[PDB]
């Protein structure tokens with residue numbers, strides 16, 4: 673659902689976050705297919721990108737309002753519902769916190785969790 677202009681807003685942060693964490697595009701594609709394991713190279717990537725867009729703070733607490741605001745009108749009710757179930761985050765560290773949220777959201781609504 674991401675609009676095509678988001679993709680250059682994000683390009684520099686994407687390149688940075690992939691390089692910092694050893695993330696591959698293949699791993700990003702996998703998350704988008706609904707497959708996600710608790711591997712730091714992908715989970716720290718997701719944390720990295722959320723932070724980049726100011727959607728999480730230094731302990732992976734989620735700014736849900738800022739998050740919903742980046743979603744299409746048609747997705748927001750469902751997204752707000754799932755965030756109701758899946759927040760607040762919890763986990764062993766910032767990456768694991770986002771792993772657990774990604775899993776939660778994917779289990780429960782699997783049109784909401786896209787990873788750029």
Ligand SMILES: CCCCNS(=O)(=O)c1ccccc1
Nearest residue numbers: 721722742784785786787788
């Ligand atoms: C739902 C977020 C999961 C990780 N997504 S994202 O950060 O790549 C992103 C997606 C859409 C808008 C902004 C950031």
Ligand code: NA
Nearest residue numbers: 711712713714
């Ligand atoms: Na890894």
